Amino acid sequence: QELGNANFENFIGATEGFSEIAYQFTSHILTLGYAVMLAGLLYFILTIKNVDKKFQMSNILSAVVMVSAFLLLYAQAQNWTSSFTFNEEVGRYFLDPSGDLFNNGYRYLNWLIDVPMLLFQILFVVSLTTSKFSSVRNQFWFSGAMMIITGYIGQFYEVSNLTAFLVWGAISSAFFFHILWVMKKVINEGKEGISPAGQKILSNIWILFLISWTLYPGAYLMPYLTGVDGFLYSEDGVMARQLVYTIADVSSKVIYGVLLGNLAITLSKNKEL
Amino acid sequence: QELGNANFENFIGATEGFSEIAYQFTSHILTLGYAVMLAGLLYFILTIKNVDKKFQMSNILSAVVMVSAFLLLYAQAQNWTSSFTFNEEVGRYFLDPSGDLFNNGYRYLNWLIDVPMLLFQILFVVSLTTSKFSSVRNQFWFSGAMMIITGYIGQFYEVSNLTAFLVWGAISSAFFFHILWVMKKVINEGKEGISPAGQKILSNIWILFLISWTLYPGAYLMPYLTGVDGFLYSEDGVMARQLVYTIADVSSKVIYGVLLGNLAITLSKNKE
Amino acid sequence: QELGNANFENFIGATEGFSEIAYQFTSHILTLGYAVMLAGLLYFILTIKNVDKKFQMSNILSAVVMVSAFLLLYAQAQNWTSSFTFNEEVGRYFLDPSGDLFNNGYRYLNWLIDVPMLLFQILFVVSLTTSKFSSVRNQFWFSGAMMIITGYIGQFYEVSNLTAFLVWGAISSAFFFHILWVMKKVINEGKEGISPAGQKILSNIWILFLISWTLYPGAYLMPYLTGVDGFLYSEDGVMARQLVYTIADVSSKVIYGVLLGNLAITLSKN
Amino acid sequence: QELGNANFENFIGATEGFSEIAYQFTSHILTLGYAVMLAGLLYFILTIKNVDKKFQMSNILSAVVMVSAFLLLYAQAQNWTSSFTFNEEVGRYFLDPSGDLFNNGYRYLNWLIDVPMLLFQILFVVSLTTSKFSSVRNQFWFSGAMMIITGYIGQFYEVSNLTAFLVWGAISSAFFFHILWVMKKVINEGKEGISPAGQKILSNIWILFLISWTLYPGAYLMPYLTGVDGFLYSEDGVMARQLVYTIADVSSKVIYGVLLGNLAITLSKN
Amino acid sequence: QELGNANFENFIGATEGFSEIAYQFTSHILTLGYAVMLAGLLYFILTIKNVDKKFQMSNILSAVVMVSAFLLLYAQAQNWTSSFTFNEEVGRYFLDPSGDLFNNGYRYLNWLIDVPMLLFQILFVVSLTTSKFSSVRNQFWFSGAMMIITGYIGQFYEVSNLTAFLVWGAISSAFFFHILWVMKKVINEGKEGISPAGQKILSNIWILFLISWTLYPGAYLMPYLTGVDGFLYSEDGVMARQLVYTIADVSSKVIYGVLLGNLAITLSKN
Numbered sequence A: 001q002e003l004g005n006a007n008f009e010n011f012i013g014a015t016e017g018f019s020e021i022a023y024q025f026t027s028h029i030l031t032l033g034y035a036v037m038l039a040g041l042l043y044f045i046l047t048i049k050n051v052d053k054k055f056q057m058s059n060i061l062s063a064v065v066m067v068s069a070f071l072l073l074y075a076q077a078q079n080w081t082s083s084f085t086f087n088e089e090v091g092r093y094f095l096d097p098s099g100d101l102f103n104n105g106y107r108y109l110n111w112l113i114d115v116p117m118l119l120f121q122i123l124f125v126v127s128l129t130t131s132k133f134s135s136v137r138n139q140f141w142f143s144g145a146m147m148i149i150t151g152y153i154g155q156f157y158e159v160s161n162l163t164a165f166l167v168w169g170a171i172s173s174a175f176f177f178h179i180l181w182v183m184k185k186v187i188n189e190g191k192e193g194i195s196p197a198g199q200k201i202l203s204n205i206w207i208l209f210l211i212s213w214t215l216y217p218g219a220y221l222m223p224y225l226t227g228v229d230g231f232l233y234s235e236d237g238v239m240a241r242q243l244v245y246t247i248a249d250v251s252s253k254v255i256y257g258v259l260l261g262n263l264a265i266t267l268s269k270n271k272e273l
Numbered sequence B: 001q002e003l004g005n006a007n008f009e010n011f012i013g014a015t016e017g018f019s020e021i022a023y024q025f026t027s028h029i030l031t032l033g034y035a036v037m038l039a040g041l042l043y044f045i046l047t048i049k050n051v052d053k054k055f056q057m058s059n060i061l062s063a064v065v066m067v068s069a070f071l072l073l074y075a076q077a078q079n080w081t082s083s084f085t086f087n088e089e090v091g092r093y094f095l096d097p098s099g100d101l102f103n104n105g106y107r108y109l110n111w112l113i114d115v116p117m118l119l120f121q122i123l124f125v126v127s128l129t130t131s132k133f134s135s136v137r138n139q140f141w142f143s144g145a146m147m148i149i150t151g152y153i154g155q156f157y158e159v160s161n162l163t164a165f166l167v168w169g170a171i172s173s174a175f176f177f178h179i180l181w182v183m184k185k186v187i188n189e190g191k192e193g194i195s196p197a198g199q200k201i202l203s204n205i206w207i208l209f210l211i212s213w214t215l216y217p218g219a220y221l222m223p224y225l226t227g228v229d230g231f232l233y234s235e236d237g238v239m240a241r242q243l244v245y246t247i248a249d250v251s252s253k254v255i256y257g258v259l260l261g262n263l264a265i266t267l268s269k270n271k272e
Numbered sequence C, D, E: 001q002e003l004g005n006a007n008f009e010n011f012i013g014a015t016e017g018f019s020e021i022a023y024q025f026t027s028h029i030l031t032l033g034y035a036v037m038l039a040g041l042l043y044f045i046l047t048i049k050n051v052d053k054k055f056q057m058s059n060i061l062s063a064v065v066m067v068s069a070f071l072l073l074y075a076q077a078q079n080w081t082s083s084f085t086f087n088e089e090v091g092r093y094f095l096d097p098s099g100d101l102f103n104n105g106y107r108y109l110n111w112l113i114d115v116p117m118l119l120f121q122i123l124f125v126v127s128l129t130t131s132k133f134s135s136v137r138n139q140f141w142f143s144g145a146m147m148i149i150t151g152y153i154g155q156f157y158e159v160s161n162l163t164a165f166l167v168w169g170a171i172s173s174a175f176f177f178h179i180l181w182v183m184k185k186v187i188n189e190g191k192e193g194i195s196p197a198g199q200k201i202l203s204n205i206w207i208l209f210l211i212s213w214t215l216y217p218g219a220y221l222m223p224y225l226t227g228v229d230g231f232l233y234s235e236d237g238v239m240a241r242q243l244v245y246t247i248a249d250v251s252s253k254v255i256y257g258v259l260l261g262n263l264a265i266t267l268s269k270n
């Protein structure tokens, strides 16, 4: 059937269909995703007063990230369960286009508003030395937007046009490397003039940032990471992609936010942990 | 088929239908729209005590704007996904009237209650000099209501009666120019007697206000901005309209509210 | 088609159907209705500490009114969109009984719990002089309940039995006049011993109360206000009724609550 | 039609069906029910700081009761509208089993967690004299659980097996009388050593408790209170049962909680 | 019918179907489950300031557990009502695969994020003596994750492959015994140098932990606890499993959280 510029989940769903395990696991992991975001929202609000006033905007931005992450990852989960329906004759879940096609775009538009806030919020905890606040912020915001927008365009072609898919992905990757570059500077300058305890947390934040953010391009490419007609161009690749996206989102948003909160505590002139 | 006084989204949906990209993008952008409003709601509540008591009503009004914006833009998003259904034979999304026709009216009624609050809330941060509070408020509220009501009537005719569409739009535009006039005065008087930092933020507020508010009439006209049978009388114009409305709403409500909060901080005798 | 004791919206929907404008406008105005109630909820909670402790129960009761008004007016909005479905052949929205018949009863049961709270809450801002708190409260609550219950019964017959409709409406009106009487006394006693600023706000509250509460019996009668087969026995009367109910509910609940809050501020020593 | 161990609402719905008034009223009253619970939730949270710290646990338990009452009574309302669908040919609402059968069990499981908290919370406001806190609590919790569980079992048989229905109901009634006994002692001991104002509120709490709690067994028996093929074995009995359950739940949870809060205020040193 | 690697609920539903009591009870108990979690959420937020700052993280983690437990157990309840539909001809609820198959996986993924937080939060109330905080935490988190993941895999095979089901379950059990071991040490070290009041609560916490956590493997095996074609390989086993899971979740999360809060109060210098 004609699916056009649709995600590979739909092609698997329309041809092989999904086993009970593939369909249920994807539903469960996407549901856990939005559930963790609302739990995180509660954590960030309830811990605001654990740090000095000057650091509380970081807790607030974490909470702001959680609210939209809950809503968009809730929509993403419903998109999954609505798009694939059980066939009694074969006992597998097949594309049910009456529920609309499945698209990972809900997650991407969450990134569009989260990336700017996540990159911004560290600047409310650490102090820059040589770099200008305005300059770092503007670079984060510009490259952040371009990275997500170019990737959003690319993922529509992940089956229909592999060339467009890889070119847009490559452009996205360029902006990604720029952000890694700027964030590395921010971490280094942030370490200057703070306790060894604070410096250790910033080191952990850099590792978390590096691993969690790198998962995303991996999830982007997932279906083709085992080449043409590979193991991952299957329900196994669908499960893998949705697991990785969910791990990345929890790591880049919630764990990132917790570590920043712990940093703010060590830098706080009143409180301690 | 007979659609009557219906938005052009329905005519595109009933003839050409929407590609995966056009349908999914519109769904995504409308969903982002209501998600940003609920995120904004949290931001405005959590930052209330960042400014002196006298400024806190501005945070409160921002929050009030967010609550209804979330609800109305949520309804608007559901209206989209319910009104267009995938056709397996051609692989495009076509008008599914069992979900009702699509209408941008949910967004308009949000404007009706938001415009008065957005125009009002700046008067809790800045001090007027030459203008009377009651006079400015009454002009904002009267012209604000008339602008939205006349526009709301017009958009029903955007396909069925181009003349009614453009006349109501023109009347709406008149009230719009009046509001721009009054708000310009409010900004100028607000700058008088405050720190240069506060004056700079008010300058940014004026630019944001001018650009964000002008996007609306653009979105109103979107389908016809490339003339008869133009590039925008298509799924591309639908995508463009819903993107512009979403950008305008985020800018005029959330970013506006953040800048007013930042102004209140600079004017606050405790914070800096 | 047998509709029995059903609101006239269903009869219009089953015969003429609704134009795009009539259906969409009604959907939009009913949606705005519940949206304003949730916005009001936030306003009343966030402004609690703007008045002295003794006045804060009024903010609390406003908030209590908003919560149930949001839920009931949300249900009322869904009742509308579920009950009328687009017919592609004629391009109008017709009664779709699979969604149940439309009934204004959700709004009425909101009134049942709101009327007592709205009448009660002014007694936490103003001080009575010659009248006893308990006596005024008991009169408000008894007449308030009877007014809503008798009206609720009446509106089921607004098409099926014009006599029952008008008799129950008349009984309801009697209790309404009693409430107007008691509220007038409350306003007068409330004005005694407070600043001219406070007295002005109470005057505005009385005008708001009088206009907003009178809109309701108007919305009750709406379909027949232009007589048999008049202009209002149509989709135009449906639009008019739902607009008036929404204006009345916003005015009697939210604007009323804001004015009471502003009164509390002027009467506040802080 | 084979309905098995199903509530009588289904048998009425499957045979006579429900008139517009019977269906709409039941929908409205069940909706009001959950709407009042969420409004109550707001009231109990916003008034926590109106009493001394030692009494605030009572406000908290009221709020805890409201949250689950909202959710369960919301589910109960949706169960009603989903189970009965309009038939255009006769103009009545008939059992639509695609929506599942209607069962009052959502309300019962709410009782299971509410009864223990409602009986418990008064022990945070009044001081016992003869009785031990732990002992009264344990009696309330044990008899409360058995009362609801035995009743929950019984109501499944209210049509399929009148004997099982009446026996389980009788066992439930025994636990009910035990609770009335213990609560009476608690009220009496609570009156000892407090202001006459506090004693009057406790008297009102006892009357509210006695009337509101006795409504439940009445609603249990409702369909048969006019005997075989009586007036109440009808849509009129369905309306009556759902009205009584809603009045009882509002009274036993919200009004009870308000009176306890008012008692806590009179006993408060601040 | 071809169901593949599906839970036994689906096989009962596809063959015998469910009686009114079995279907309604399961719906009610699953609904109570998520309702208790949201009520618990309110309790934990409202009691945060009842303990010294250093203990408040325990209240916060209880609340965090409640939020996701509400959402996941809500999804689990909807999965039940969507998967089984009334058949009018036989009067039983049969598998309706248009609603997707029923899977207990929503509950398992709640465990995945809850187990780490529940094991973690006690370390914010008690003080270790001989054991290192980081070491206990890392063991809890590693074994906690492996226990849930291995169990999650196993339950997909509970009908399709009894060997895989029992082997994965056995591996899960190994990690379970490790956690019981570490938690026992934590309780013992926690008792050292604290008031008798604190020691009593920790004893109660250990009993609650031991009983509530052991319910889970019981619910895992439920269908086969009476052997092949036993009493429990039926709607009675489905009811039993969902009851036990709901009791376990309430006990391990809410009651556990309340006891930890009570411990924090006794250890609080205010």
Ligand SMILES: CCCCCCCC/C=C\CCCCCCCC(=O)OC[C@H](O)CO
Binding pocket: B137, B138, B141, B142, B145, B146, B149, C204
């Ligand atoms: C063609 C369309 C016809 C439709 C007709 C639409 C009429 C305009 C509606 C409202 C204007 C609002 C007027 C603003 C004046 C408000 C007065 C005020 O602000 O008073 C506050 C008072 O001081 C506190 O007590």
Ligand SMILES: CCCCCCCC/C=C\CCCCCCCC(=O)OC[C@H](O)CO
Binding pocket: C132, C134, C135, C136, C138, C139, C142, C143, C171, C174, C175, C178
């Ligand atoms: C059928 C025709 C309808 C006729 C229209 C009737 C209008 C007047 C109704 C009631 C007046 C008084 C009712 C009072 C109800 C008891 C409460 C009360 O007033 O008692 C105060 C108490 O003593 C604390 O001070």
Ligand SMILES: CCCCCCCC/C=C\CCCCCCCC(=O)OC[C@H](O)CO
Binding pocket: C224, C225, C226, C227, C228, C240, C243, C244, C247
């Ligand atoms: C407050 C905002 C409201 C805006 C919404 C407007 C809805 C119209 C409402 C009432 C119209 C009443 C008009 C009545 C005048 C005609 C009287 C008449 O024609 O005669 C009566 C009849 O013949 C004897 O049975």
Ligand SMILES: CCCCCCCC/C=C\CCCCCCCC(=O)OC[C@H](O)CO
Binding pocket: E134, E135, E136, E138, E139, E142, E143, E171, E174, E175, E178
């Ligand atoms: C293939 C079948 C064989 C598999 C059967 C599995 C049996 C598991 C038994 C015990 C778990 C003990 C696991 C050890 C936990 C290590 C925790 C950890 O990684 O953290 C280190 C911490 O610092 C402390 O030393």
Ligand SMILES: CCCCCCCCO[C@@H]1O[C@H](CO)[C@@H](O)[C@H](O)[C@H]1O
Binding pocket: A162, A221, A224, A225, A227, A228, A229, A230, A233
């Ligand atoms: C850098 C990572 C990009 C790897 C590109 C691999 C190209 C895969 O090629 C594609 O494989 C699909 C799955 O088998 C097939 O359905 C397509 O026909 C084929 O074009």
Ligand SMILES: CCCCCCCCO[C@@H]1O[C@H](CO)[C@@H](O)[C@H](O)[C@H]1O
Binding pocket: B162, B221, B224, B225, B227, B228, B229, B230, B233
């Ligand atoms: C200020 C912008 C308004 C200019 C109005 C342009 C006139 C548009 O003209 C309209 O274009 C539609 C789309 O092609 C056609 O379907 C209509 O038949 C035609 O009337």
Ligand SMILES: CCCCCCCCO[C@@H]1O[C@H](CO)[C@@H](O)[C@H](O)[C@H]1O
Binding pocket: C162, C221, C224, C225, C227, C228, C229, C230, C233
């Ligand atoms: C106070 C206003 C009440 C006036 C009652 C006027 C009588 C209404 O008359 C009614 O009009 C309907 C619509 O045209 C007709 O369908 C009914 O048959 C007719 O009874």
Ligand SMILES: CCCCCCCCO[C@@H]1O[C@H](CO)[C@@H](O)[C@H](O)[C@H]1O
Binding pocket: D162, D221, D224, D225, D227, D228, D229, D230, D233
């Ligand atoms: C305390 C009240 C107990 C009274 C129970 C006895 C009434 C049983 O009467 C029942 O009435 C039903 C409806 O009319 C019939 O369908 C049943 O056949 C009949 O048993």
Ligand SMILES: CCCCCCCCO[C@@H]1O[C@H](CO)[C@@H](O)[C@H](O)[C@H]1O
Binding pocket: E162, E221, E224, E225, E227, E228, E229, E230, E233
């Ligand atoms: C508790 C761990 C041991 C349980 C193993 C018991 C063996 C169950 O055996 C199974 O019983 C099912 C139910 O009757 C049958 O349908 C299956 O065909 C049969 O393999």
Ligand code: NA
Binding pocket: A064, A065, A066, A067, A068, A069, A070, A110, A113, A114
């Ligand atoms: Na987000």
Ligand code: NA
Binding pocket: A080, A081, A082, A083, A084, A085, A086, E099, E100
């Ligand atoms: Na599905």
Ligand code: NA
Binding pocket: B064, B065, B066, B067, B068, B069, B070, B110, B111, B113, B114
């Ligand atoms: Na708004």
Ligand code: NA
Binding pocket: A099, A100, B080, B081, B082, B083, B084, B085, B086
């Ligand atoms: Na759709």
Ligand code: NA
Binding pocket: C064, C065, C066, C067, C068, C069, C070, C110, C113, C114
């Ligand atoms: Na209300």
Ligand code: NA
Binding pocket: B099, B100, C080, C081, C082, C083, C084, C085, C086
């Ligand atoms: Na509709």
Ligand code: NA
Binding pocket: D064, D065, D066, D067, D068, D069, D070, D110, D111, D113, D114
């Ligand atoms: Na409850």
